[model samples]
Target: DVFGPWYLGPIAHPAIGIRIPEIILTGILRAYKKRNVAGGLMLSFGRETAPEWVINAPPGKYEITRGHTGTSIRKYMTMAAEAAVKEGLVVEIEADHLTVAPSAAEAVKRISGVRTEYRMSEKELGESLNYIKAEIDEAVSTGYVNFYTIDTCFLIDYSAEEMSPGELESKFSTIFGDGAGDLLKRYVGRQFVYIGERGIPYCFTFTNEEVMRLALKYRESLKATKTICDYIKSKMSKPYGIEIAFDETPSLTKCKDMIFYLRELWEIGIKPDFIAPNIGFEKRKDYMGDLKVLEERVDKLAAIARAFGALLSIHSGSGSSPYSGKGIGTYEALLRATGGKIKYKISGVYIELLFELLASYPKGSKERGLYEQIFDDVYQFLKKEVEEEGVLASPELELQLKRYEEDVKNGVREERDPRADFFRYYSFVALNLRDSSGKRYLREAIVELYEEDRKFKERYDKEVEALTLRLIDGLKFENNIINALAWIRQF
Candidate 1:
């Protein structure tokens, strides 16, 4: 429903995806309600809101939609604009889509009876990076968007990590060579890295099970886990050039200590780029609280990260209010709290693709035919459920999830997806964990399969090679990222 101008603007800026309407509306409505509609102005220090009375309080409700034809969207906007006019407020309606579809605007003009002034969005050639990097650059050139990251690209395709530092440098040399140096350089001015799953696996309380076990026992002893990060930083060709995304797990409990930890990482000479303090809460799941606390933490973190000359990164950037996935709160306050000095990593955007694919297989379909596309979907799903969604839903994923848990709880499974006593033992362990921490531990264990020694690594490597080659051979990756975007454009 938010497919309004603000929502649609990001269509040109593909990184925003379809969430533009929601994000834009949240910002506008929050600003309108808080500032009384004039937006930020002559604001007092304690009260960050503008004058309250300036916002329009409408008596009659207006509706908008992406209609059967272009006129539907046009009329919807014109009515909203007229409402603003009637309410004695100024409205800026950007018709960026006009150039792309002039007839659409023509249809809008016809239906709404408002002469819409049009400004064509100049197609700027973004600095070429991979398909992914190009999208981020497109978003950053627009002032409203900021970019950030930390070790996000680390866990991409197995092949990417398998490549030697020399090969990686060569493979991505074109992407890095564009005077940006690396993924960190390209996104240096942006706001997203730290919140990404590769950087913040601990955002999901379940994924952080190991850390919690260690933390609950060791309680903030930086000695053991420092190596996990240090090993990675040592591996980087340009470690100092990259930012350290200090992923703050809620189990750490002392949020301020997260800020302290950033300083610790910084003192060791590893400059952090962003610190994403996880937010949001759900019963029996990830319990987070008000952005007010997190905002304060980001401020504290900003000082440390800034001393290292890096930005603050916010995790769980998407989803609803800190309460649950319900309350409609504008991300503006959180963004402003960081002085917009952080990159809001839109990692979950790809989940839109996962949900689409997951739904593609009806409940009773028995085809593993879909399994071919399952890797990317599974990868994206894991990133969402474990890192972004805050919990991995083992019950829904059924057997595979169970298998993952069992392998982690007991010893490693000898066979890969084999139907044997080992498999039964694995299933048994997965289904009967008594404690909450047990379940969480099992989930982490399953994911650890990927990080295990090189045998499983070979399986993953084969999958990627087959898939990438399939894509090149024109057999179609079907639900793959490259193909998915192509399909969306065609539609």
Candidate 2:
């Protein structure tokens, strides 16, 4: 339904995907009702957290682990879709980041105590394929999910840019076999190709290694995405959209790489509705770079996206801090470059903002006490995890926190220092924290307080509106932010 303008203009509305838990959903509903601002809302759940969400549903609750099943994701997606329908609002349900990364530890052990190490062989990819298929099967059965984001970073080869022509050709042959020659003949040395009315330039400007690297690296993932799409369409009675996400990769997504990836998708009869490329946007941090450079990069990327009939998605797109001009100019540059044809995703930041609001309460108040408790729990938990598992405990980061010891002791670091912003928010997984008596701590307290406290809810609504306006106004949306919020309220 959001496909009307398809390109940026007055009619082109940037779709917002809000990662929600039950509490977040309640906040959204109340905020909308209070402000009468409406737009299409895409509800998302990452694979790892979906099960925990379902287990924590009201009336009865349960604990969760890393590799739990996705039944909760399906249940919540249906609940969200039904809620949207009841509220007369447009909704897009997404099964976010169906990652194909192989397990790092041994997945199976034989009776002889032999462990099977995960690898990127065809066997591994096939297994991952089947795993993703099972998740899609549930989504199709529920009929609520219209968006699928395929995460195939593990399948992508990032080192192809440095290979020799012979090495590239040999690597290509090993991967593509007989088809490699034909593909090379058609694509190598070619400067441009047309998709419908739009022309996209190939990377003939680079050496054959550079030209072929992205294509080789991405071809399998594209093929895998096509397979998943085929399975979905074959089972569904309605239309759906698929997005190819390589945004988590280390390097910035290049124009040449975009063309190659999309071309490969096209060759196999797959047309992604969106493509999320890494544009150097870091999580929970403001864009601290040259705006002109960002604009030029986004313009070129957006042109390629338009040619492919897809929008460029900015992932990890949050972090326009109230205290700093972080993401302000970067978003403006993106909107200007793409003509506003973009799907911007912000997930954990709303929760991050919730923590910030809680931190604002006066010390020794119940709210402040609870906030301090949660912060300590997270700090202690993460500190232990760092010691035992060596996760997030960098020498540099430890030294950085040590410098802020005084501010932390004063319990005002979240206000004075931007670095303290994510310390508690990222540790939200510790919401699962329980006492020796099996009493759930942080998760239950925050949700119940938010539900019962009118003043808290109002404060949260303000935070949501302020953040929303920052992104909306920065893009120079034609509709006034207040009016736009209200207008999108209608289904």
Candidate 3:
């Protein structure tokens, strides 16, 4: 139950909801052991989001998708713990992303569909804290969670970056009062330097504007994280690891941006085991730009991360498709950039992999029929949302539905093509979908098919394993525990 401060070489964080921990861990265990590497499967990377927003296990006032499913934390944690025990491996169960956001529906919307965060309104902050406290209580009661990711990205101010110098000063002062200049003196025009992996030098310095923007942007977020951090510690019966989520900001994080954020966190004595910054990748999309440029970006961010005694976490880690959830050569670049000491996270890809498999079955088969029904379920749900102005509805989602419809009319795209935007983004909604009897039949059928049908189960197991192996190998996680041991005796 000990949480290691050791370097976790390419911690392959999988966001799994279904009961397949053994299957997922098999891939992870085999990847290291087959190579005779002890990458420490002892603390597995079985992970999930803030408990309240979890698909099951109801908490808070926010009804996910208008009452579809409830309560899953204890069950998921039990499966993960049992899988590790049976496999004779180890991995920490992170109550991943104990997030505080504007609303619960928007959280799933971003993770499962589009990547967008709403503006923060502290008016309901009291409510957000209460929601997380309840979730923390439930997760801790299970006695399985050994790590937590405090995600306060919703508290960030995206408008800070674009504000004019005059506007920046005004807002910064409004938030920080007379002490605004006092804070700026620590960072503004101050030079901090570090030599990164492979002797690459990184220089971080902020001007007055950059300092103010970062300060005002994260003032509330930082405070909220500290509050949540203290609360989590209070609830835990044992020592646990902490991770900070800062990837939900509007733009790419710069050197000074990270330095300022980390500095503030440390000032509050809130150093996390890991911190996820925007590494310039969008959720559900592959690495979108030049590789060497990405290498530079990671090397720079990682330089500061190591200095702060924290590992760098890559969020929005899954690519547009399950087959190539990460762009080619992407993992290689990150592996080399961090000297193989980092954590990479992929949440929905496992489920996305399941979706594609469901479509591969014959059109008349139950598997294929279930897939089609879920597809239509997502379509109709979103259709009603757009018509009714539900919180989940958006012009972008509406446009996606519209474009898919046009494509269908012209026969340019098949209705169930995985490429269809509507299917790609919104299909996960079907997981919580309810039948007339208020049963989550769709989610049930998925589990029943996998558990009862060996053929289907094998395909899922192999595919999930394959995905895990790629991440382990790509990030050079093999022999990671050995690496940690070698570094243990150092100062």
Estimate, for each residue in 87-167, the C-alpha lDDT of model 2 and write its tens digit: 655445666676675541121011012223234888888876776777677666776666677777666765576777788
Which number leads on TM-score? 3
Model 3, C-alpha of 148: deviation from truth (Å): 1.1
* TM-score per model over all chains: 0.29, 0.78, 0.87
The deviation in Å at residue 398 for candidate 1 is: 7.0
Clashes of 1: 17
Task: Please list all clashing residue pairs in model 2, or write none if there are none.
Answer: 37-485, 37-486, 38-485, 38-488, 38-489, 39-488, 287-326
After superposition, the stretches of candidate 1 with alpha carbons farther than 4 Å from their true spots are 1-255, 280-297, 320-327, 357-491
Q: Scored by CA lDDT, what does every candidate get?
A: 0.29, 0.59, 0.69
RMSD of each: 24.6, 7.0, 4.0
Question: Candidate 2 or 3, higher lDDT?
Answer: 3
In Å, residue 334's CA in model 2 sits off its true spot by 1.4
Q: Where does model 2 exceed 4 Å of error?
A: 1-20, 26-48, 52-71, 103-131, 193-208, 320-326, 390-425, 435-440, 476-491
lDDT of 1 by residue, 1-491 (tens): 11111211111111111111211222232223332222110111001111112111121111111111112222323443444344443222321111111222222222222333333221311111121232222222222221223322111122342555565555454533553233233223333222321122112121222222222222222332243345433333321123233332223223333534554455456444344444432211222466565555444445444545555544333332112221233343444444444443322222222222323444454212232233323433443443543322233334455555577567675322222222211221221121333222322332344346355334433432332232112211122233223423442
**Of candidates 3 and 1, the better by TM-score:** 3
- Tell how far residue 377 is off in model 2, in angstroms: 0.7
Ranking by TM-score: 3, 2, 1
Name the candidate that leads on lDDT.
3
